[PDB]
Amino acid sequence: ILPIMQSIMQNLLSKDVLYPSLKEITEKYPEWLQSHRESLPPEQFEKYQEQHSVMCKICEQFEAETPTDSETTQKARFEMVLDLMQQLQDLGHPPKELAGEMPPGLNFDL
Numbered sequence: 001i002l003p004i005m006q007s008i009m010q011n012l013l014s015k016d017v018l019y020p021s022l023k024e025i026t027e028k029y030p031e032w033l034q035s036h037r038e039s040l041p042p043e044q045f046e047k048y049q050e051q052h053s054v055m056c057k058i059c060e061q062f063e064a065e066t067p068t069d070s071e072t073t074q075k076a077r078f079e080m081v082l083d084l085m086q087q088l089q090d091l092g093h094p095p096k097e098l099a100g101e102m103p104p105g106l107n108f109d110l
Contacts, residue, residue: 013078018106021101026055058085
């Protein structure tokens with residue numbers, strides 16, 4: 001099952017599938033963070049900034065893709081994105097107001 005698992009991940013975390021939604025939610029964080037800073041515990045505020053940072057790194061990987069990327073660059077880039085997505089999961093729930101807008105499987109409610 002390791003192979004089919006692998007190809008589902010490759011499909012789900014591809015630029016074509018994930019990038020539009022991800023980019024849109026990422027761009028909502030800065031203004032949400034600015035207006036909620038005063039009312040949040042700094043520890044939770046830091047987690048949200050970290051989510052924004054991790055998501056920016058993913059968008060940057062997607063936006064760096066070119067039609068002339070080697071096979072090893074494409075595999076390395078996927079592994080970075082997978083790596084970053086794990087870190088996103090380990091950051092727990094997004095802000096309530098911004099939660100639930102990722103593709104199925106990628107809405108972390110923990």
